[model samples]
Target: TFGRATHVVVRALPESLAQQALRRTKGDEVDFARAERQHQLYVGVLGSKLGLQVVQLPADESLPDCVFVEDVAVVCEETALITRPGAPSRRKEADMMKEALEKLQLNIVEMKDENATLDGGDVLFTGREFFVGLSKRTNQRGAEILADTFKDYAVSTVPVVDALHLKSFCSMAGPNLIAIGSSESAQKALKIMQQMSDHRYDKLTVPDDTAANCIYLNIPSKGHVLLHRTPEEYPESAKVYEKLKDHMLIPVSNSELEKVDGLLTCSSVLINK
Candidate 1:
């Protein structure tokens, strides 16, 4: 139902990224200059190599997670749902994303309830239906609202426990293929996903949970999946990456951003024009 992406929206890394993000554990200091360079390379690849019309949004110093723009809005074929970010600090970002989607002439649907919180990271579309995760960042009420908003489409909610979002443990690799991590929670979620789709899903499992998150980009001819670079330390994951040999695999290094629990998909929002 979706066409090849003609436009992609990305936000530049803020100067305050190092000190402002919410992290689960303490890590070495983030090199601001290096992070900026990495982000530039990512944006360049999206524009020059992938042939996407890139829309670069200026960094907001006040918002630490501003660079992770994918969490601000969920874009469907003709409509975009501006999300109410689970974190109060990130809630303000939805307004800016709303304006951008409006400029694209997309029908904008705002999540207006004050108590219902939803993060775009918890929503995943599999061409045929939507799979929403009930995580710490997305509550049941938010999922219900999403279901009501997308009543024309098949929307289902899954429980998320082992990761930050549902996408943190799984993502679509192709039209019917999904990559999932080998975790107890991921396995349970996979079972639910299979049932939801009537057992018509292909899956690839990686040993490391972090490597499981990927973004499936619809190109002119085929599916190009963007995945996180498996560190040399994780040989098992590298072996799993080999399983994706049949499809186009684009590996992006997100080590610096991972310190803040940022995944590859968090960097941008791809929209079909």
Candidate 2:
């Protein structure tokens, strides 16, 4: 089987998406209407185009951060490792996600520590190992919990300073392949990942920092499918994707969502069955 996902867990966009949200988000003001539209297109692709199951959760208007569901849990195989979100406001949003994962019949691993705070966006699953980002939201204790829960895999801590999360500037473009940004911090994190582990990866360095956040899905039918930013959003970065002739490139729009520090993988918790 390809490294395909059976289901993608997404949360509905709240009406107050732009009204609240963003932990030092470098983006500008967001448009709730446009945010919702972009989210629909994102969900449409996960289900209609990619043929993956879509599990959407109801939005809690009071919690504008709930829409970015990927931050609450780290998914690997059939196990869902629930994270105590680093942001105090986001900590309350975890149980709702736990209930959804249980309803889907996935195993749940709770980090019992009271002080541990971790965000799923800070955790990168390279298919073979794990790279946890030590960020403002995710502390050392958070990384410890991840390593404690996923003992079978090698977990490495790479500090994040320039961006909100490790995924904000980088993501897996293919198996053991990293799509990294040209920013100073992005390059530093990439170098750390290389030195921290013995595993080697093919790196795709992109000019647009956010363009590094592309999604890589290897479907049994499609071989390798990559969802990246539209050329309109990042023309220079869009040109680089053309080099990946081996993958089925699907350019998706997330301009409005990005304003609230959203990304393709940020909106959904991808689960491989």
Candidate 3:
């Protein structure tokens, strides 16, 4: 069953992205049309190159962050845990996502407590365990609730102080390898992750924080690592790319998405049906 199924769930980019995205630059306008085109390219790579079944959900014009479908739920091997987004405005995302998951016939675990808000972006599932971040968006209660839900898996909490989400500062490159950022908060989170795991984790520290938010794809030949293409001005990014050259690296242009704090992993949810 594990080897037979592979699917990727993505959501269409909403037109309101420019005005509605929760971003650092409040007034800076996002080119909605360009964002849509970039999103198509992103989905194309996942579908054609990766050879995964792509299930695209319709755009909810009212919801700007809907394109970041990864924040809606944590789709595991057997169950889909629909999250209660920390941002009240984004909470409705879970409802829309549930319908998509149901179409895939996944076992749904909905977060019931309104007080405990968890965004799927803050939850990182290592092949063996779950590392949840306690960020401004995700609280201790949310982490506790997630721990209780995935009781079969090892669940631990880390604090996210410098990044928007846990995955924004670090991501698993492979079974025991993690690419992380150099911020003090990222470093502290790495320490916590190491302490929580039974196995030692090898680290690839990136000088640029944005580069840390990469997605590891276990494809046919060798595992692939997807990351945002670093601009020419950022020399540190080249070093990090060189370090990961051995892996099948796919550098995607996500300039527009980055403006809204969106990263490579934020665009979709990879699932094994």
Candidate 4:
């Protein structure tokens, strides 16, 4: 079975006081700063442990929030899809990703101009299928374009109502398995998941805090999977991970990543060839 070959991209800490000072509430600001540092540290350490390639986006006017750059690119084989973030301020984030990817010799395709609302988190790709999410951050048109663009593959759209993004709730594992969370549409979605299973896709239902979006990094030298620490906070998730503990696991401190609606999957786009 083939696994995903991934590139891990992370944001550098902001040095400007004006931008840093935007955090008005002292308590909130302190927590935000701590979380930012922890997020960087966790990803850096985790990537190092896995022996995955790690690169940082160049600090430039193009990136107002370094973190946004992590969420703006979708990796599809050798081609990188740069998203025009659904959140207005994050538009530049995609440009930064484009520049960085170009430097790395990856072909760039874009979701731009009027077709401007795409978030990497809302996009999911199995080796054979591309599943997009119609959520607050991703619209129908975006889904339509993606489905058509990847028509050569079995592409489909799944609705996202329980979480910020589809990845926040579901993702495919090893082409044969899918991990998801419980929702009002749990049974209905299960039917979809079941279909994927019938075609040889197994499914794992995670707890409600959205722990299902963890990153599955397939490093050539070391086999390890990294995800945010949200799963550790829920006992139910611990049980799930426990059963699958033979796989290497790296935990991230996403306390703030959570506040800003980010998760392990949201932190970076994984490009597989």
Candidate 5:
């Protein structure tokens, strides 16, 4: 009776920023060849089933490290929130996503220059709650802006002192449930979840290095989920994924994507109805 989908705003190949980001990524694909295959396959396998839309960003000048699309933008409930990337070269990345969203007839919201130094990856949301992660890539001012924008929703600021971004270690599993890593801030997030839902969650904590972030895709019109294979290897996540295996659990093996610390949740933006 329902279809669950996600929209991916991707940049073209030969991206200098992607190279630099991948240099720090945990996975290993030297060129765009394997990366493209993995990305497309990952999306294709779930396209109609998951209702995925691939929005390609315009190619940018080869400035050694330009067009890092992933770090700079976010989409929520069919609305695209273009970020002012913390990294200078990535500042233009949001416009690329904006153009695509415009063509799709989705509403576009840009976090202004006053909301400078913010990356969309830092914002984590549940239906009634939103957590703005404060980091070097996303600051307090942007969090305030987001709080104001989503004033109807209960918004809170969570500091990512250890991880590069919030999704690096946390992701919502259900309106009330979340999978998080063992960090002080993550523990705080758990408390916030409790306050928002007033229901104790079926929580699981992943290993220190395993990407705890996951995409909760109820595709196939059931309680299905897609998570990174690395986390499945973790004792905690292994137990959880197996328990939910009766429903489809699509595993994306982006060994190369992790090189930049990407995970299941980082691959696409969720558009919840």
Candidate 6:
């Protein structure tokens, strides 16, 4: 149900990307300029290729990780919950996102507990339920708040021991269909997802973990659409997406952003209105 994305919100890549808070990336090694260009193409795909209304927010030079708008808030059908980012430096990014979500006229819910820390990257809303990943950027208190906020859906927490975010190695490809990586940690998390729900998801496993962090959406007129890694970046994983015979597969080059631990889904927050 959540896969029908009408619009997506994204922010411009900050020039200070080299100073971003990191768990798996080398700041100095990243080429911020190229990453910005890559981000432009990414926005293009959402607008031109997928036909989704793209909301582009100006970059905050002071916040190195401002481009990761997905880490700022979790938007469902009519309400938006502003998350408290686990990284202290990235928390301020939520303020701007809050203003943007406000203009969109969605019911706004804010996390007030100082002790609760959550990132939108750790939150996955299946069409049926919610799986909040407890990672370095998300904890028990944060998950509790999320459960309270969305009382209608079942909320389950998965321990994210190996990835930066739960979505770093998996994402929903369709209704109850998951695209995940074959790595040990990724598989472990996948098992937990299977355990929490009665519905058995059709799994699409890719070799490269980064490749697993792709985007899938069903546009009103366009049908099934998926954005994945370029073949040059993950040849084997790219081949696996070909098995998705019905999807309009788009190969996106995210080489520069990948160096900074960025994934395709991390740059934008998808919302179905």
Q: Looking at candidate 1, what is the lDDT of residue 229?
A: 59
| Whole-structure CA lDDT of model 2 | 0.87
Which runs in model 6 stand beyond 4 Å of their true positions?
Answer: 19-23
TM-scores for the candidates: 0.94, 0.96, 0.92, 0.82, 0.80, 0.96
Clashes of each: 0, 0, 0, 3, 10, 0
Error of 1 at 165 (Å): 0.8
> lDDT tens string, model 5, 59-150?
66553333345466565566666777766756666665677777776777788865566776677776556777788889887777667666
Best by lDDT: 2
Q: Give the clash count for model 6.
A: 0
Error of 3 at 95 (Å): 1.7
Query: Which residue pairs overlap in candidate 2's backbone?
Result: none
Error in Å for residue 117 of model 1: 0.7
Residue 107 displacement in candidate 5 (angstroms): 2.2
Error of 6 at 255 (Å): 1.4
**Cα RMSD to native, each candidate?**
1.8, 1.3, 2.2, 3.8, 3.6, 1.4
lDDT of each: 0.81, 0.87, 0.80, 0.62, 0.61, 0.86
Give Cα distance to truth, residue 145, candidate 1, Å.
1.9
As a TM-score, model 5 comes out at 0.80
Sort all candidates by lDDT, best to worst: 2, 6, 1, 3, 4, 5
Error of 1 at 220 (Å): 1.5
Q: How should the candidates be ordered by TM-score, best one leading?
A: 2, 6, 1, 3, 4, 5
* Superposed Cα deviation of residue 29, candidate 4 (Å): 6.8
lDDT of 2 by residue, 1-273 (tens): 335788888999877668777546555678778888889999999899999999989998888888889899998777889999888878878988999888878989987688888999898889888999998989999899888888889999999998889999999999868999998889999999999988888999999888999889987778799999999999999999988898999999999878877787899888876
Find the 10 residues in a row with the least total lDDT in model 5: 61-70
How much is the lDDT of residue 206 in candidate 4?
69
